[PDB]
Amino acid sequence: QIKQTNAGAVYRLIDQLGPVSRIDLSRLAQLAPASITKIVHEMLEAHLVQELGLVVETEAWHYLSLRISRGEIFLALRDLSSKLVVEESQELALKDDLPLLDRIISHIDQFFIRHQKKLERLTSIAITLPGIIDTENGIVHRMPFYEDVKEMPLGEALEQHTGVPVYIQHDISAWTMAEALFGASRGARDVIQVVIDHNVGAGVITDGHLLHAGSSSLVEIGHTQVDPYGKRCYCGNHGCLETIASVDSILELAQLRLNQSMSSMLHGQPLTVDSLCQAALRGDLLAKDIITGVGAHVGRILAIMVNLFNPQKILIGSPLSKAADILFPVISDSIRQQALPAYSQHISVESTQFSNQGTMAGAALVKDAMYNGSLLIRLLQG
Amino acid sequence: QIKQTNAGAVYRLIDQLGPVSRIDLSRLAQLAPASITKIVHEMLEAHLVQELGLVVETEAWHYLSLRISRGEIFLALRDLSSKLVVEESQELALKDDLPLLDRIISHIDQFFIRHQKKLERLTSIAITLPGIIDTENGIVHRMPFYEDVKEMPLGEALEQHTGVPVYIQHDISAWTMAEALFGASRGARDVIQVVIDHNVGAGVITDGHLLHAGSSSLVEIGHTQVDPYGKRCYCGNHGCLETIASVDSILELAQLRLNQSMSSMLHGQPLTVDSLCQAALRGDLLAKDIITGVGAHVGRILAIMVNLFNPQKILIGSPLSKAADILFPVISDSIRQQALPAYSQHISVESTQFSNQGTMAGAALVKDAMYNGSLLIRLLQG
Ligand SMILES: [Zn+2]
Ligand SMILES: [Zn+2]
């Protein structure tokens, strides 16, 4: 276990600083040159690492990142650098004879069969899905569009099946980790990342650490009830924030409001977050009102979170950030009016660096597993 | 450094779950039989540990536990078990000639001079107080009752003056750790402890770690907005929890509504929190209304915190715990109504085991330093 951390800490460095020397790794990782020698030599003998100084070897090593969303599975074969080999997306019908679990395995098998020739060593699967997720054990408790899913052993069934580690994460936590490693929150101690998407929620980084990291519970603010009379949520409650502020719910609402309007510009195109944001940025009062509304709800909850966590940055990750110039000040205003001035004083509401499209976040699951060394040791089996 | 972590882990499992043999510790603390003999022996030598299995030897190992409050200082001499040896309190006037740091040091000096024959080995001094605290450097940045406190190096100075380690912490943080160690939350790796007195605060442990351990910030629930039409808070915003749940506001409101409700039992006695709670339990409509009122406000925040943190235990530390039969069900019901079913399902809202009068909390600071092995390393110094 001590071995596990050390290897990962040294891999991290090679990854981040390579070309880098054995001598340098020694001081930076605070580890005896002898330990560094040992760790590095295992890495060389596995082709996890190459010489020139030390550097990572990424081509020979692949992973699958899956993403699941409403009626769709995305699959991507990628290098450990995260470079894409092949990408597919497929129908995942919402209702079917077969359990979702199988249908999933089925899609994966088809992928390997199809692109079997592009495959180098498969190291792991990174999965990113909506729902209520035990990322420790890879259990999907409940999830949004496939009503059929209850305590689904996604992680275990897939490890059993592929013989490879399965890293499963919620979309939001995955994204938070991506922004932490590669994004807008690198080397930040205290961040709250809010995501307004098909999901509503947040990841938190406190004292430099991802809250709940590698535990079986997540930050689950999207399921704090805001309407005691609202629509049923897949969590098993009703009126959850996600019910009101998810992108899909905003758009259902806009549609209903649009139906009573004959004045709105949103009548010009099919209704999409993009047209929503486009219209609001022009001063369409309906569109603006809608975005303002979401602002108020998210602001409110974010304000509570500010009082508890005292973050340095707030990252909004969302299609609505197209309308940053309406959305962000509303969030800002809530936080200023609703959190301790001393905590709320010099807080920037800023957008996320990434838009989290496709399977891009999977890289954060893998690098994370390399860095904490868990995947690393599994790899050093050979 | 590397030796520390283990030594702390080792003392920890001997402390709670002793007597326990070498080999039983080998598997529990995950260190080789050879490493488990080494650490224990040093412990047998310095007498930190005794044989029978291995028991903690504590009677002849003292620390000074300090508590600063409104114009007052509590000093108490304690067993490493936390067993009281002697306990005194002094005047600490809000304004004086000799700076506060002096008068404090001066007080401690006098304590030792006084209780000399009862002293054994002084291991450390634990200090507990309100204010903003550099828990790391023992710097008191600011603190409520002594406006003259700015950047006070309480830690540095007392160590320099006494030569013993000096652990400083905020009331609520110390209390939160004290309930997890000796109190109502023993066993939980995850706890929200809400404190409702003249101030509203909270401590949160997730994964056996104090939230904000790595900074000077507090879980400032007191300032979360519970009422967008409420009254101004000293923070500047409106409708802060504290505005309504602080014992003071509660009595303020009771006083207001009592003034018209000449049915209130609350007319026979002067208006104390206790008479209020006594009357709520006797089913007085106003008292019960007011207590319920406070409950639903706190309940709402706690619902959000549950979704944030997923604790196993919620502890209320308050005079209002006298109304637990009323306050707690209302809080429980909020959580159940408002938070993620998975998280709301088996959660206990129970009362804090201690009221944190005096110094029963310092104890946690020392125990912690004994468990991370920092004090332990110091104590194997000689
Ligand atoms: Zn929900
Ligand atoms: Zn306030």
PDB file of N, CA, C and O in Angstrom, chain B residues 3 37-48 380:
ATOM      1  N   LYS B   3       8.135   7.242  10.523  1.00  0.00           N
ATOM      2  CA  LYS B   3       8.010   6.535  11.804  1.00  0.00           C
ATOM      3  C   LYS B   3       6.816   7.024  12.621  1.00  0.00           C
ATOM      4  O   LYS B   3       6.173   6.242  13.333  1.00  0.00           O
ATOM      5  N   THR B  37       7.062  -4.676  17.042  1.00  0.00           N
ATOM      6  CA  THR B  37       7.882  -4.873  18.240  1.00  0.00           C
ATOM      7  C   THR B  37       8.674  -3.592  18.556  1.00  0.00           C
ATOM      8  O   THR B  37       8.750  -3.172  19.716  1.00  0.00           O
ATOM      9  N   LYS B  38       9.233  -2.976  17.509  1.00  0.00           N
ATOM     10  CA  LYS B  38      10.091  -1.789  17.620  1.00  0.00           C
ATOM     11  C   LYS B  38       9.388  -0.616  18.302  1.00  0.00           C
ATOM     12  O   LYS B  38       9.882  -0.080  19.298  1.00  0.00           O
ATOM     13  N   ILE B  39       8.236  -0.235  17.751  1.00  0.00           N
ATOM     14  CA  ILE B  39       7.443   0.891  18.246  1.00  0.00           C
ATOM     15  C   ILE B  39       6.963   0.653  19.686  1.00  0.00           C
ATOM     16  O   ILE B  39       7.112   1.530  20.545  1.00  0.00           O
ATOM     17  N   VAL B  40       6.418  -0.540  19.940  1.00  0.00           N
ATOM     18  CA  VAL B  40       5.906  -0.913  21.267  1.00  0.00           C
ATOM     19  C   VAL B  40       6.996  -0.859  22.326  1.00  0.00           C
ATOM     20  O   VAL B  40       6.752  -0.405  23.443  1.00  0.00           O
ATOM     21  N   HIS B  41       8.191  -1.323  21.970  1.00  0.00           N
ATOM     22  CA  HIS B  41       9.303  -1.340  22.910  1.00  0.00           C
ATOM     23  C   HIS B  41       9.634   0.074  23.386  1.00  0.00           C
ATOM     24  O   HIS B  41       9.657   0.332  24.591  1.00  0.00           O
ATOM     25  N   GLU B  42       9.851   0.991  22.441  1.00  0.00           N
ATOM     26  CA  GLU B  42      10.066   2.402  22.766  1.00  0.00           C
ATOM     27  C   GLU B  42       8.960   2.916  23.685  1.00  0.00           C
ATOM     28  O   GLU B  42       9.232   3.637  24.646  1.00  0.00           O
ATOM     29  N   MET B  43       7.722   2.518  23.387  1.00  0.00           N
ATOM     30  CA  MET B  43       6.560   2.824  24.216  1.00  0.00           C
ATOM     31  C   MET B  43       6.591   2.175  25.599  1.00  0.00           C
ATOM     32  O   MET B  43       6.129   2.765  26.577  1.00  0.00           O
ATOM     33  N   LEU B  44       7.120   0.959  25.675  1.00  0.00           N
ATOM     34  CA  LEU B  44       7.275   0.278  26.959  1.00  0.00           C
ATOM     35  C   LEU B  44       8.325   0.994  27.800  1.00  0.00           C
ATOM     36  O   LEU B  44       8.157   1.141  29.013  1.00  0.00           O
ATOM     37  N   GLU B  45       9.384   1.458  27.132  1.00  0.00           N
ATOM     38  CA  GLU B  45      10.486   2.187  27.770  1.00  0.00           C
ATOM     39  C   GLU B  45      10.025   3.499  28.402  1.00  0.00           C
ATOM     40  O   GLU B  45      10.188   3.702  29.607  1.00  0.00           O
ATOM     41  N   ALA B  46       9.445   4.377  27.585  1.00  0.00           N
ATOM     42  CA  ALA B  46       8.955   5.674  28.058  1.00  0.00           C
ATOM     43  C   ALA B  46       7.708   5.537  28.938  1.00  0.00           C
ATOM     44  O   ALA B  46       7.257   6.515  29.534  1.00  0.00           O
ATOM     45  N   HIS B  47       7.176   4.315  29.023  1.00  0.00           N
ATOM     46  CA  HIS B  47       6.028   3.977  29.877  1.00  0.00           C
ATOM     47  C   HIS B  47       4.694   4.475  29.337  1.00  0.00           C
ATOM     48  O   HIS B  47       3.708   4.497  30.069  1.00  0.00           O
ATOM     49  N   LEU B  48       4.665   4.869  28.064  1.00  0.00           N
ATOM     50  CA  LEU B  48       3.426   5.288  27.386  1.00  0.00           C
ATOM     51  C   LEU B  48       2.482   4.110  27.232  1.00  0.00           C
ATOM     52  O   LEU B  48       1.280   4.288  27.010  1.00  0.00           O
ATOM     53  N   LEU B 380       8.718  10.668  23.012  1.00  0.00           N
ATOM     54  CA  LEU B 380       9.810   9.696  22.984  1.00  0.00           C
ATOM     55  C   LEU B 380      11.161  10.408  22.827  1.00  0.00           C
ATOM     56  O   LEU B 380      12.182   9.785  22.525  1.00  0.00           O
TER      57      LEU B 380
END
